[PDB]
Amino acid sequence: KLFRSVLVYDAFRFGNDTNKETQEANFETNNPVIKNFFGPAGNNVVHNKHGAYATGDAFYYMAYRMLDKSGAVTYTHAMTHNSDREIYLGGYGRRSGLGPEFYAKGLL
Amino acid sequence: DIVMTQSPLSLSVTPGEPASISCRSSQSLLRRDGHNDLEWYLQKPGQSPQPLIYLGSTRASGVPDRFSGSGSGTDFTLKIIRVEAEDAGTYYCMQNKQTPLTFGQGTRLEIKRTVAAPSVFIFPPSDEQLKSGTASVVCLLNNFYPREAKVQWKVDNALQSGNSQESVTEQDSKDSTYSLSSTLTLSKADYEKHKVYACEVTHQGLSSPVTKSFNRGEC
Amino acid sequence: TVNSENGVYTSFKNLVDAMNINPYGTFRLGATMDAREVELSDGQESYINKEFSGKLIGENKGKYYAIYNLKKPLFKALSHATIQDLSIKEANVSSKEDAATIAKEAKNDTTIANVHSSGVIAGERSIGGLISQVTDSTISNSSFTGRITNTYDTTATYQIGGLVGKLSGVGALIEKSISSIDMATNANTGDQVVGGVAGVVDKKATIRNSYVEGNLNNVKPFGKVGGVVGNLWDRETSEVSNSGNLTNVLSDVNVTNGNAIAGYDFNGIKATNTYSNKNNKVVSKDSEEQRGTVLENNIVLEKKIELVPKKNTK
Amino acid sequence: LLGLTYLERWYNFKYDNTSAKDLVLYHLDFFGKSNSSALDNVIELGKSGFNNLLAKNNVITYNVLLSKNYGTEGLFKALEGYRKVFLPNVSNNDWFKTQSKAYIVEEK
Amino acid sequence: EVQLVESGGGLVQPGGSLKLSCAASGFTLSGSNVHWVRQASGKGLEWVGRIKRNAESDATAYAASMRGRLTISRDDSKNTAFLQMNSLKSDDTAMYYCVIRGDVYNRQWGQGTLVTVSSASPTSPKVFPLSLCSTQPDGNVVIACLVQGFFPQEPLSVTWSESGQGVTARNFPPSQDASGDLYTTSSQLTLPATQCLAGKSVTCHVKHYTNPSQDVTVPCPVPSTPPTPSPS
């Protein structure tokens, strides 16, 4: 069951040549990246304040960046969130009381 | 001209209970067709009262035994052999020949059901209305029998009046239990003055009033 | 190059003229028919804008005939009108309002028999495979084939079906008809209902011996969509009495984001017989995809109703 | 103009030197269905509506409207057919890698 | 339809002239003299007057307070009766009823008409799609539709997107706003969790006196909270 296909994104917060300011994008900015690929690939991200959040079938980096080490760590945390009921556990779901974050940070 | 009058005005009666009402005449009973002027009526929700027994001494066809049109002459007699949950309403006797149609005083009927505790479903005001300079806190009460209840719109535990009021439906078809809804109307200037907004409803079914509060800026 | 007077057998122009001048009469066709002969007015919505037409119209005269190149709905409404042995081989009708191949409405007691339509249909507000909405009327021995598209995302409700969109009537029902619709649409909200055979049936509306063959597609699964019928919940107060029934219905539809038999189930489902062959039947969002809702019967191939070849229109 | 813009914009890729612009806009009979008309195709695509012309539904539009003019089953089946005719002996994934301008890295 | 069709009413400013035509179809209005008796909103019926039958000399008499501004007539040829209203005032707002009397062949109860007398123009309602931001019921999802700032109280039809078993939509009577004679009322809906789990975003449809439907969208609340990690 590890041969599935799940997509992850970066934060859409593109930087500038002059100052280290990663301004957001809202499917309407003039950056050619969102004009050509991110735009036509229709899916809106909630643009959370902070923290890279998982959806259940996908994932989107929000505060971290996928090239760095912290990117990899949050990636492991994200896939623990995404592949919890079916992959890491033997088809059995979460424990009836414990929430999604129990399996995320302390272990796995 | 032919004045129709009714002594009873309002009453609560359980189903299957005999109720009797008499309407009197002050003038001649002559009609256009010569029959008695009186025409019985029963109010129904969502519409006007419907005729029950016209011509006075003639029982209208299709009318069940519950409503008795045996009244004749100046005096009349109408009964309610069994009461139905859908028979709630006001009863009119009136003359229909001459110019001054004189209706009876009317006897509103309410169906006697067991006291129930309403549920609470509060809704925070939408931010769109906040952009309009007004506010509306929705506090919902559902399917309770005792319509007699008082609603307090305590803004930061301070009751306000004259702008926010209540809205109560009528008896339900399924179970004849009223539902209550109240809306807190506050201007934006008053909205920013106040942080916590609370709805208080004092109801007989409620052992104690149930209040839900929203902090300003929840939405 | 000639016209007929005693009976309009020649041209669609004369037939439209006869419908308009004589909404109430008996009519018959005696030649091949093309609907592009008459010019469709932009303001006009139906080829016949009268209240009713084709009261006793038919194509029973000798060999059955067909009408070609339909650009807009044939009739505006039906009031006891009867259409017999009608055939449509080409259809491109489309309108932002309720668009249908033969009529927008049928108010009372309109019996439609041996009608077959072929072509592509489009619309926004509603689409009927034959009629957008019918009341207190029945259609039998019918069939439609073609492509249906109402993919607009507008929140306005549309009751869209492979034969009829909305069917509200105690005496109204569809019996023994074929729905070979290559339909794709966008269900959007639950108000918009999609049906392979009938979009929605209400007021104790029964469906007997009707089969859907073509594909049913709504891209987003939020709305109510069914392989045979969309839903049976009455628009009036909720009772199973007026919900209606489905009997002897088989769905080979490759329905996407929807069930093979009924889009919305009931606690008490009146549908006595549900037939579904080995097809695409499995299309936190747990229930967003169907898992053999009411289709897990008659998985093997079943005999098809044999009414298709006896149309004999050529 | 709208239909031509859409088809030219979303079909710039080239099978070797052969361009899919000219192969989708023109030669509709590349698979059969020789009775189709390219001008009618473009006109109908122009009048298909705002929802169809939307970039998020390119595959849906090809499957629902553009198809049955080229004789194809689906968009990806059509691209597979083009890759089988032009540029054979090269797997479709290799062609996609050599055609896209996005830096794609695959880790066995 | 099958009713006492009254025309020329609706919203109208005070001091204006309103012409009411109580039309009949399917029965002989000549054999049933038309009587107009108005009723206040939630109150009893208050007599106004009538015109007798054609055989009854078409006698016209008016109420003492209302006398001087009534032209009560009828036209049995077109199966219609006339009620004329002049010098409109706020007290004249009532549930006007033309009724058929003096006939045993026709006594079908008419639907009447709603006449509201106020110089304020009809105002489109402000449709606010309130969502249950707080916790939902254990087995049900509650979604409410709120409309405010609509002047005319004549039919306000609020209907929801889709319903089935276990859904009991509740609507409240109109409530007049204290300022501007406007009105404000809400609409409530109950939704099972299973329907919202698959999606089924509910849209609220509201109907005004003449304004078309406002099809606002209410995303039904089953959004899993994004497990955003706090900065470390």
DSSP character string of E102-160: S-SS--PPP--EEE-B-SSPP---EEE-----SPPPSSEEEEEEEEEEE---S---EE-
- One fold for both B1-112 and B113-219? yes
| Backbone interruptions in chain D following residues (C to N > 2.5 Å) | none
Cite the beta strand spans of chain E per DSSP E.
Answer: 5-7, 18-23, 33-39, 45-51, 60-62, 73-75, 80-85, 94-101, 113-115, 126-128, 140-150, 158-159, 170-171, 175-176, 183-192, 202-206, 216-218
Helix axes D38-46, D2-10, angle to 10 degrees: 100
Q: Nearest CA to C170 among C127, C141, C143, C201?
A: C201
**B118/B180 Cα distance (integer angstroms):** 9
CB-based contact B82:B66 (threshold 8 Å): yes
Q: Which residue of A has its CA nearest to D58?
A: A40
CB-based contact E95:E40 (threshold 8 Å): yes
DSSP helix/strand/coil, E101: strand
**D65/D46 Cα distance (integer angstroms):** 12
Question: Nearest CA of chain A to the CA of D54: how many Å?
Answer: 8
CB-based contact C276:C295 (threshold 8 Å): yes
CB atoms within 10 A of CB E160: 23
Give the ranges where E70-113 is alpha helix by DSSP (H): none
**C227/E105 Cα distance (integer angstroms):** 52
CB atoms within 10 A of CB C262: 27
Q: Which residue has the tokens 């639907």?
A: E111
Q: Nearest CA to A27 among A16, A17, A41, A15?
A: A41
| Structural tokens at position B210 | 């149930």
Cβ-Cβ contacts under 8 Å for D84 (sequence gap 6 or more): none
Q: Where are the domains of chain B?
A: 1-112, 113-219
Residue E93, H or E segment = none
Residue B65 is classified by DSSP as: T
CB-based contact (8 Å) between A39 and chain D? yes
**E34/E7 Cα distance (integer angstroms):** 15
CB atoms within 10 A of CB E121: 9
Q: Nearest CA to E141 among E166, E109, E118?
A: E166
Q: What technique was this entry resolved by?
A: cryo-EM
CB-based contact (8 Å) between D56 and chain C? no
Q: Which residue of E has its CA nearest to A77?
A: E229
Q: Which residue has the tokens 């807009």?
A: C72
CB-based contact C62:C30 (threshold 8 Å): yes
Q: In the Cβ-directed half-sphere of A83, how many Cα atoms lie within 13 Å?
A: 14
Question: Nearest CA of chain D to the CA of A41: how many Å?
Answer: 6
Question: Taking the CA atoms of chain A, what radius of gyration do you get in angstroms?
Answer: 16
Q: Which residue has the tokens 């999609």?
A: C194
Strand order in the sheet with E158-159: E158-159, E202-206, E216-218
**C281/C302 Cα distance (integer angstroms):** 17
Contacts of A81 in chain E (CB under 8 A): 227
Cβ-Cβ contacts under 8 Å for A50 (sequence gap 6 or more): A62, A63, E228, E230, E231
Neighboring chains of A (3 or more beta-carbon pairs < 8 A): D, E
End-to-end CA distance of chain D: 45
Q: Nearest CA to B111 among B151, B79, B76, B80?
A: B80
Cβ-Cβ contacts under 8 Å for B175 (sequence gap 6 or more): B113, B143
Residue E228 is classified by DSSP as: P
**E88/E16 Cα distance (integer angstroms):** 5
Q: Nearest CA to B191 among B122, B127, B139?
A: B127
Helix axes D92-99, D75-85, angle to 10 degrees: 90
* CATH fold group of domain B1-112: Immunoglobulin-like (2.60.40)
**D62/C293 Cα distance (integer angstroms):** 31
Q: Which residue has the tokens 């259409």?
A: C83
DSSP states along D29-79:
GGSS-TT--HHHHHHHHHTS-HHHHSGGGHHHHIIIIITTTS--S-HHHHH
Q: Is C24 exposed, middle or buried (0-12, 13-18, 19+ CB in 10 A)?
A: middle
Beta bridge partners of E204: E216
CB-based contact C169:C139 (threshold 8 Å): no
Phi-psi region of C52 (alpha: psi -120 to 50; beta: other; left: phi over 0): beta
| Structural tokens at position E84 | 């004329």
Question: Nearest CA of chain C to the CA of E153: how many Å?
Answer: 23
**E165/A18 Cα distance (integer angstroms):** 61
Residue B111, H or E segment = strand B108-111
Beta bridge partners of B51: B41
Q: Is D6 exposed, middle or buried (0-12, 13-18, 19+ CB in 10 A)?
A: buried
Please judge whether C224 and E202 are an interchain contact, meaning their C-beta atoms are less than 8 angstroms apart.
no
Beta bridge partners of C305: none
Q: Is D44 exposed, middle or buried (0-12, 13-18, 19+ CB in 10 A)?
A: middle
Beta bridge partners of B159: B154
Question: Hey, of D60, D64, D65, which one would you mutate to test binding to chain C, going by the most C CBs within 10 A of its CB?
Answer: D64
- Domain B113-219 CATH class label: mainly beta
CB atoms within 10 A of CB E72: 21
Identity of the residue in E37, E132, E175 whose CB atom sits nearest the CB atom of B101:
E37
**A9/A43 Cα distance (integer angstroms):** 11
DSSP states along chain C:
----SSS--S-HHHHHHHHHH-SSSEEE--S-EETTSSPPPSS--SSB-SS---TEEE--SSSB--EE-B-S-SBS-EES-EEES-EES-B--EESSEEESSEEEEEE--EEES-EEEEEEEESSEEESSEEEESS-EEEEEEEEEEEEE----SS--EEESSEEEEE-TT-EEEEEEEEEEEEE---STTSEEESSEEEEESS-EEES-EE-S-EEESSTTSEEESSEEE---SSS--STTT-EEESEEE----BSSBSSBSS--SS-----EEE-SSS-----STTS-SSSS--S--S--PPPTTSGGG-B-
CB-based contact C208:C176 (threshold 8 Å): yes
| Structural tokens at position C163 | 């034969």
DSSP helix/strand/coil, A26: coil
Give the ranges where chain B is alpha helix by DSSP (H): 127-131, 188-193
CB-based contact E31:E53 (threshold 8 Å): yes
Q: For this experimental structure, what is the resolution in angstroms?
A: 3.6
**B152/B202 Cα distance (integer angstroms):** 8
